[PDB]
Design an enzyme around this catalytic site. Structure first.
Site, PDB file in Angstrom:
ATOM      1  CG  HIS A 156      -0.532   0.223   2.444  1.00 56.08           C
ATOM      2  ND1 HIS A 156      -0.404  -0.769   3.388  1.00 56.08           N
ATOM      3  CD2 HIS A 156      -0.166   1.262   3.373  1.00 56.08           C
ATOM      4  CE1 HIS A 156       0.158  -0.394   4.401  1.00 56.08           C
ATOM      5  NE2 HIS A 156       0.255   0.729   4.267  1.00 56.08           N
ATOM      6  N   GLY A 168       2.753   5.398   9.731  1.00 56.71           N
ATOM      7  CA  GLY A 168       4.367   5.544   9.368  1.00 56.71           C
ATOM      8  C   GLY A 168       5.339   4.205   9.484  1.00 56.71           C
ATOM      9  CB  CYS A 201       2.918   0.279   7.299  1.00 54.84           C
ATOM     10  SG  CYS A 201       1.507   0.212   7.926  1.00 54.84           S
TER      11      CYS A 201
HETATM   12  C1  LIG Z   1       0.906   2.072   7.955  1.00 55.32           C
HETATM   13  O1  LIG Z   1       2.135   2.471   8.356  1.00 55.32           O
HETATM   14  C2  LIG Z   1      -0.321   2.014   8.894  1.00 55.32           C
HETATM   15  C3  LIG Z   1      -0.147   1.380  10.058  1.00 55.32           C
HETATM   16  C4  LIG Z   1      -1.448   1.618  11.258  1.00 55.32           C
HETATM   17  C5  LIG Z   1      -1.554   3.038  11.176  1.00 55.32           C
HETATM   18  C6  LIG Z   1      -2.117   3.292  12.541  1.00 55.32           C
HETATM   19  N1  LIG Z   1      -1.780   2.048  13.561  1.00 55.32           N
HETATM   20  C7  LIG Z   1      -1.259   1.178  12.366  1.00 55.32           C
HETATM   21  O2  LIG Z   1      -1.034  -0.079  12.802  1.00 55.32           O
HETATM   22  N2  LIG Z   1      -1.489   1.350   7.927  1.00 55.32           N
HETATM   23  C8  LIG Z   1      -2.547   1.928   7.448  1.00 55.32           C
HETATM   24  O3  LIG Z   1      -2.495   2.917   7.519  1.00 55.32           O
HETATM   25  C9  LIG Z   1      -3.358   0.963   6.909  1.00 55.32           C
HETATM   26  C10 LIG Z   1      -3.486   1.138   5.658  1.00 55.32           C
HETATM   27  C11 LIG Z   1      -3.642  -0.172   4.825  1.00 55.32           C
HETATM   28  C12 LIG Z   1      -4.407  -0.429   3.425  1.00 55.32           C
HETATM   29  C13 LIG Z   1      -4.915  -0.948   4.553  1.00 55.32           C
HETATM   30  N3  LIG Z   1      -4.661   1.260   7.376  1.00 55.32           N
HETATM   31  C14 LIG Z   1      -5.210   1.161   8.729  1.00 55.32           C
HETATM   32  O4  LIG Z   1      -4.602   0.591   9.585  1.00 55.32           O
HETATM   33  O5  LIG Z   1      -6.504   1.668   8.932  1.00 55.32           O
HETATM   34  C15 LIG Z   1      -6.767   1.698  10.477  1.00 55.32           C
HETATM   35  C16 LIG Z   1      -5.954   3.043  11.208  1.00 55.32           C
HETATM   36  C17 LIG Z   1      -6.154   3.244  12.413  1.00 55.32           C
HETATM   37  C18 LIG Z   1      -5.672   4.368  13.106  1.00 55.32           C
HETATM   38  C19 LIG Z   1      -5.080   5.348  12.369  1.00 55.32           C
HETATM   39  C20 LIG Z   1      -5.091   5.307  10.822  1.00 55.32           C
HETATM   40  C21 LIG Z   1      -5.521   4.089  10.433  1.00 55.32           C
END
Ligand SMILES: *[C@H](O)[C@H](C[C@@H]1CCNC1=O)NC(=O)[C@H](CC1CC1)NC(=O)OCc1ccccc1
Ligand SMILES: *[C@H](O)[C@H](C[C@@H]1CCNC1=O)NC(=O)[C@H](CC1CC1)NC(=O)OCc1ccccc1
Lengths: 306, 306
Positions: free
Chosen positions: B41, B143, B145
Site C-alpha cells: 500500500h 508510518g 508499516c
Molecule cells: C501504515 O503505516 C499504517 C499502520 C497503522 C497506522 C495506525 N496504526 C497502524 O497500525 N497502516 C495503515 O494506515 C492501513 C492502510 C492499509 C491499506 C490498509 N490502514 C489502517 O490501519 O486503518 C486503520 C487506522 C487506524 C488508526 C489510524 C490510521 C489508520
C-alpha cells in the site's frame, strides 16, 4: 495505537560487548575506545566474595592475567586500574564500533534499556526503571554481570548502569560506569537490605494518560482533588509525593488529553482506595509505574534514532 | 533470577531497515541482498485505500517512482514486482549488512520481536505473540508499516512478520515476508473482524512454571486433574485445548520443577475458577500467555546469539 513496554534498539551497544576472563571467572565487559569496563569482582574466587579485599586481590594481577575477547579475536591488555567498583582494562585496539556515548548517573524513577549478555554475547533486551530504593527488577543469571543499561538520544548512547549483583529479595543492583553503586550496596556476598520501595507516582500518572490517549478511559471520574489531599493519600499507599515540578512535567500530556493533572490524581485516588474491581488498564490489572512521562510521549509521537 | 518480557537484540535487523517513498506515502522497507520488501500500500493515496485496485495502481508506477533511502544514501531501483501484499524492489546495491536470514510463516501461539520503525529508522523493540486469531497486540503509529517481526537462532534471523494495519479493536495485522496475511485480513481500509481470541494455554502453563522456577509458588495446590477435565474447564474460560503434544513440550519444565503437567493444570483450574484473589504472579495480576515454553527455557538457561 497501542502501548507496549519498549526497549531501545540495541545495535550500538551490541558492538561494545566483550568477554572478560580472570582465572575461572568470566563476565561481560564494555569496550569503548581503547578501554574495557567490567565489574571488579571478575578478580574474585568463590571464597573471596564473602569479604573481598579488592586492593589486595588486584595487586596479585598483571595485565596478561586478563583475557579480553571481542567475538573470536583477543584484545591485548596493556594497563589495568580500579575505579570504585569497576575495573578499567586498557587494550591495544580502539573499538572500531564505538558509538557516540556519554556516561550518566540516572535518577530514581528514570528508565533505561538492559542488554542482558552472557560470555560477551547478547541474550535479549528489556526495559527497566531505577526504583526509588535504587534497585531494578531485572532478569539476570550467573554470568550476566557487566551487562549494561543505556538510553539513546538520537545517535548518542548514554550508559547508565552496569550489573553486579542480586539481592535476597530477588531484585538487582549495580553501579554507574564510574563504578559507584546506585543505593547503599557493596560488592560482597552478604545479606543487604534495600529500602522500603515506593511507587513512582508521576510515572503512574503518565501511564494513566497513555491509557486515555489509547482509548481506555473508564477510570475517569467527576471528582477532583488538591495536591496536598492527594499527597496525603500518596503516603498511605506508599507513593512518592507529587510536586509542582511533576505537574509541570505532565503538562504536555495534560494538554494532549484535555485532562487536568489534579483530575487525573482524583482518578488515581479512587483506584488506590477502591482497587480496579476486576477491570484492566492497557492490558494490566495493576497500576504500572515503569513509564516516565517522557517514555509515554516518545511512543505516542514515534520518536526515532537509527 | 527474575523473569521479564525480553526482546531479541535488534542489531542485525536494524542494518536492514530502509525508507521507501512513492509519491507522498513513506513507510519502512526491509533491505536484504539486492531486494527491498515493503507493504504494497505504499503505492496508494488516501482515497485509494477504501478499495484499492493494486494491479491497476502498480501499472502506473515505474522504477524511478520508488525512492529508497538507507540512511543518507539513495538506492537505485531497477525492477519492481508485487508478490501478494508485498512489493519487491530490485535495487542496484546488495545490502552489505545483510544477515544470515530465513523467511518463515509462524504458527499461532509463537512469539517474536518487533522492531518498530518510522522513516526507515528504529524507534524501539518489543516482544509479541501471534494470537490464535492471527492478530498481534503491538504499538504502531502512522508510518510504522513495513516494520518487521523476527526471531534469532544463534546467527540466523528468521523474519516472520511485516506490519500493515490496525483493526477497529486496536489490534494489529500483517503478513509474512511472502506478503500473505496472517488471518483473514485484506489490505484495505474497511471494518474487518478478527476471530474471537483465545488464550494460549500451553504458554500460560509455561509462565506458571517460570513463576515456580523464580520463587513464586503460592498458587500450587494439592489437587490434580485429567486432560479431559481440564480441557473441559479450558473451553469455559476460552482457553485453547491442551493436547499430549503440549504436555510433551512442557516436559523439560515439568522435569526442572518436579511438578507434573497435570498438577499444574489443576493449579490453573483454581486460578481460572477462583481468580487470583488479589495476589500476583511474577509481578502480574493476570494470567500471562505471551511466553512460549521455549522462551521460558531460553531466559532460565541464558541462551545467547551475538
Ligand atoms: C501504515 O503505516 C499504517 C499502520 C497503522 C497506522 C495506525 N496504526 C497502524 O497500525 N497502516 C495503515 O494506515 C492501513 C492502510 C492499509 C491499506 C490498509 N490502514 C489502517 O490501519 O486503518 C486503520 C487506522 C487506524 C488508526 C489510524 C490510521 C489508520
Ligand atoms: C555476576 O554475574 C552475578 C550476577 C547475579 C548472579 C545471579 N543473579 C545475579 O544478578 N553477580 C554475583 O554473583 C554477585 C557477586 C558480587 C561480589 C558480589 N553475587 C550475588 O549476586 O549473590 C547473590 C546470588 C543470587 C543467586 C545466585 C548467585 C548469587
Amino acid at each position: 495505537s497501542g502501548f507496549r513496554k519498549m526497549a531501545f534498539p540495541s545495535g550500538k551497544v551490541e558492538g561494545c560487548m566483550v568477554q572478560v576472563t580472570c582465572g575461572t571467572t568470566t563476565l561481560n565487559g564494555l569496550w569503548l575506545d581503547d578501554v574495557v569496563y567490567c565489574p571488579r569482582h571478575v578478580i574474585c574466587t568463590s571464597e573471596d566474595m564473602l569479604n573481598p579485599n579488592y586492593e589486595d586481590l588486584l595487586i596479585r594481577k598483571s595485565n596478561h592475567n586478563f583475557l579480553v575477547q571481542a567475538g573470536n579475536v583477543q584484545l591485548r591488555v596493556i594497563g589495568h586500574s580500579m575505579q570504585n567498583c569497576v575495573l578499567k582494562l586498557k587494550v591495544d585496539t580502539a573499538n572500531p564500533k564505538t558509538p557516540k556515548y556519554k556516561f550518566v548517573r540516572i535518577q530514581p524513577g528514570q528508565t533505561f534499556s538492559v542488554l542482558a549478555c552472557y560470555n560477551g554475547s547478547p541474550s535479549g533486551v528489556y526495559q527497566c526503571a531505577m526504583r526509588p530504593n535504587f534497585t531494578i527488577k531485572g532478569s539476570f543469571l550467573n554470568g550476566s554481570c557487566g551487562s549494561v543499561g543505556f538510553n539513546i538520544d538520537y545517535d548518542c548512547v548514554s550508559f547508565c548502569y552496569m550489573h553486579h549483583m542480586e539481592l535476597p529479595t530477588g531484585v538487582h543492583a549495580g553501579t554507574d560506569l564510574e563504578g559507584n553503586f546506585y543505593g547503599p550496596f557493596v560488592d560482597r556476598q552478604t545479606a543487604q537490605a534495600a529500602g522500603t520501595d515506593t511507587t513512582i507516582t508521576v510515572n503512574v500518572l503518565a501511564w494513566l494518560y497513555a491509557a486515555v490517549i489509547n482509548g481506555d478511559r473508564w477510570f475517569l471520574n467527576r471528582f477532583t482533588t488538591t495536591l496536598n489531599d492527594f499527597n496525603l493519600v500518596a503516603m498511605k499507599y506508599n507513593y512518592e509525593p507529587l510536586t509542582q515540578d511533576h505537574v509541570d512535567i505532565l503538562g504536555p500530556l495534560s494538554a494532549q488529553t484535555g485532562i487536568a493533572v489534579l483530575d487525573m490524581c482524583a482518578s488515581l485516588k479512587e483506584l488506590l482506595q477502591n482497587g480496579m474491581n476486576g477491570r484492566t488498564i492497557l492490558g494490566s490489572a495493576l497500576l504500572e509505574d515503569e513509564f516516565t512521562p517522557f517514555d509515554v510521549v516518545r511512543q505516542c509521537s514515534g520518536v526515532t534514532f537509527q
